[PDB]
């Protein structure tokens, strides 16, 4: 929605063909970005 580019996208879709199930997990808690600010990271191009 925000303009950009997905690097090596098709090679990903290839791997993705050979997968049946994902389990999303948390690796870098958003909460824990103490020094910097994450909450202020939005755009009209990607609205909700």
Partner 1 sequence: GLFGAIAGFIEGGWQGMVDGWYGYHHSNEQGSGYAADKESTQKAIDGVTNKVNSIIDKMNTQFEAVGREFNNLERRIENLNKKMEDGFLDVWTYNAELLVLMENERTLDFHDSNVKNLYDKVRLQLRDNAKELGNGCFEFYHKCDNECMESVRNGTYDYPQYSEEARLKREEISGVRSLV
Q: Does 5 help bind partner 1 (rule: CB under 8 A)?
A: no
Q: In angstroms, rounded to a whole number, what is the distance separating the alpha carbons of residues 32 and 38?
A: 10
Q: Does 14 help bind partner 1 (rule: CB under 8 A)?
A: yes
Report the nearest approach of partner 1 to the CB of residue 23 (Å): 24
Report the nearest approach of partner 1 to the CB of residue 24 (Å): 23
Q: In angstroms, rounded to a whole number, what is the distance separating the alpha carbons of residues 37 and 30?
A: 9
Q: Does 17 help bind partner 1 (rule: CB under 8 A)?
A: yes
With breaks defined as C to next N over 2.5 Å, after which residues does the chain break?
A: none
Which residues here bind partner 1, judged by CB under 8 A?
A: 9-10, 13-14, 17
């Amino acid at each position: 929605c925000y303009p950009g580019d997905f690097n090596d996208y098709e090679e990903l879709k290839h791997l993705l063909s050979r997968i049946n199930h994902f389990e999303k997990i948390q690796i870098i808690p958003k909460s824990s970005w103490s020094s910097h600010e994450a909450s202020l990271g939005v755009s009209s191009a990607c609205p909700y």
